[PDB]
Amino acid sequence: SMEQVAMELRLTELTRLLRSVLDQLQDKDPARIFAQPVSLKEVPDYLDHIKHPMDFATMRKRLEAQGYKNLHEFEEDFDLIIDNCMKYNARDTVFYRAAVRLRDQGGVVLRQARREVDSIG
Ligand SMILES: CCOC(=O)[C@@H]1CCc2[nH]ncc2C1
Numbered sequence: 001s002m003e004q005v006a007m008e009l010r011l012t013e014l015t016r017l018l019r020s021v022l023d024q025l026q027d028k029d030p031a032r033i034f035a036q037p038v039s040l041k042e043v044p045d046y047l048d049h050i051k052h053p054m055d056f057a058t059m060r061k062r063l064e065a066q067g068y069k070n071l072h073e074f075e076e077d078f079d080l081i082i083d084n085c086m087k088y089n090a091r092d093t094v095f096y097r098a099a100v101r102l103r104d105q106g107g108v109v110l111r112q113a114r115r116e117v118d119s120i121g
Pocket residue numbers: 032033034038084085086088089095
């Protein structure tokens with residue numbers, strides 16, 4: 001159907017816009033602390049602590065599969081990156097501090113992404 005094509009065009013453009021948000025968010029992590037999944041080889045008990053791991057590479061796979069239906073889903077996953085880190089790591093660690101910084105800097109990016117998503121429909 002034509003509707004299904006228009007639908008896919010909007011999903012495809014949502015993906016274009018989310019790709020740009022993801023690039024901007026990941027730019028705020030020059031240390032690449034959040035770039036890849038936490039290694040279950042190097043942290044064998046991680047899943048005892050964190051039930052839903054997340055990282056930027058995993059977000060990007062879902063993004064390119066067009067697996068984000070709206071900004072809220074995308075934001076949930078970003079929030080998992082931050083919140084998992086701030087649980088597993090203690091407050092004084094470079095990891096926890098990097099998550100605080102990423103949350104603070106990313107807040108700005110996501111504020112304007114929400115306006116753009118609403119505005120463009
Ligand atoms: C570069 C490796 O960094 C880490 O080892 C983790 C940072 C992200 C994270 N999320 N939950 C635990 C951890 C430790």
